[PDB]
Symmetry: D2
Subunit: 115 residues, 4 copies
Amino acid sequence: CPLMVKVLDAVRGSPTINVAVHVFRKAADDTWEPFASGKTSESGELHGLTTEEEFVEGIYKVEIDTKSYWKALGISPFHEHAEVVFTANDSGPRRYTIAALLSPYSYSTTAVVTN
Amino acid sequence: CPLMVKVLDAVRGSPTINVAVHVFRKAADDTWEPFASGKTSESGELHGLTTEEEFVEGIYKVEIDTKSYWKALGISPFHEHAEVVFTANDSGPRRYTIAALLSPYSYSTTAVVTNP
Amino acid sequence: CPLMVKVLDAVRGSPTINVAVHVFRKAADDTWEPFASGKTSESGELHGLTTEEEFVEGIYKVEIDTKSYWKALGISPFHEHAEVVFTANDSGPRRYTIAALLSPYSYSTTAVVTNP
Amino acid sequence: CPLMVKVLDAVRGSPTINVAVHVFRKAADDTWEPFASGKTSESGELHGLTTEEEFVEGIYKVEIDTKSYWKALGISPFHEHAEVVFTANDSGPRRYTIAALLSPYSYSTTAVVTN
C-alpha cells in the first residue's frame, strides 16, 4: 500500500466518514488524467488506491470533497474542496500518508513519508 | 482592497518576501481565465490585486508558488504549490483575506471575511 | 508594542472580540508572578500590555480564556484554555506577535518575531 | 486504553520518536499532581498510560517536551513545551486520542473522542 489518505473533523472531534476522494496524474500535454477514487471509512481512512508497480515517478494530485461533507452536517463552508499536489518517488519508492484536518473556514494538510 | 493575501514561515517565525501569487476566475465555459498576479512585500502581504467593481460574483482560484521559496533556501519540499478555491460575493460584496502558514512537509490556510 | 496577541474563529472566519488574556513571568524562586492582562478588541487584537523597559529577559506565559468564548455561543468545547510558554529577549530586545486560531475540538498557535 | 498520544514532525515529514510526555490531575487545592509518563515509539505513539477504573472524572493536563526534540535535531525552537488541558468523562467514559503537529515556531493540537 504505497498511498493512503486520513481525514479528521475539528468541530466535532471525530474521524470524517463517507468523504469522497479523487486522485489524478499529470499528462505530457499538462492536463490532469483520472487515476483512482473512493470514500473514507468509519475510521476516516482510505486504503487500496494503487499498487507498487503502478505508482511510478510523476506528479500527482489528490482532491477531497470537503464542501459536500459540511453541507451534509448543515454547516456553511468557505472552500470548494481541499487539494494536495506533489512529485512522487524522486529518490526511489516510498510509502505516503496524506493527513488532513478540517474546519469550515480553515484546513491543514501534512505528508508522512516512510521508506 | 476587496482581496488581500498574507504568507508566513513556520520554521523561522517570519513573513515571507518575494513569493509569487497568481489569481484565476471560472468562465462560462468551465475554463480558468487569468484574473490578477503579483509578489509579496517585506511584511509578507500582497495588496491591490482588484477593485470592488471588477470583483463580481464567481468561483476564484489563488495559487501560491511555495516550491520556489523553499528551493531558494536549499530545501526540496513536499508540495508543488498551495492552491485555494472558493465562491465569492454570493450574498453581496465582502472583503477577503487569504492567509497561508508554511513548513517543508505541511501547509495550512485560513479565510477572514468581513462586511464593510 | 513589544508584545501583541491576535485571535481568530475558524468556524465563522472572523476575529474574536471580548476574549480575556492573562500574562505571567517566572520569578527567581520558580513561581508564576502576574505581569499583565486585558481583553481583545473588535479586530480581535490586544495592544499595550507592556513597555520595552519593563519587558526584560525571562520565561513568560500567555493564557487565553477560550472556554468562556465557546460557552457564550452555546457550545461545550474540549479545551479549558490555550496556554503559550516561551523564553523572551535572550539575544537582545525583539517584538513578539502571538496568534491563535480556534475550533471547538482543536487550536493552533504561531509566533512572529521581528527586530526593530 | 482510555488515553493515547500521537505526535508528527512538519519539517521532516515523519513521526516524532523518543519525545517525553507527562500527565497530571488537578488537586482540591488547585495544584497539579503527577499521574503518568512515557516516551513516544518509532510510530510516534504512546499507549498504556492509564486504565478504565483509574481514569475517573476530573481536570487533566498533558505536557509534551518539544524543546528537547528540536535541540536533538540542531534546530532553534520558540516554545518551552506544548500543553493540553481538558475536563474528562463529563457525560460518561470515553476514549481520547490527543494528536499534535509540530514546527519550530508553530504547533496545532486536536482531540479525537470515541464512545
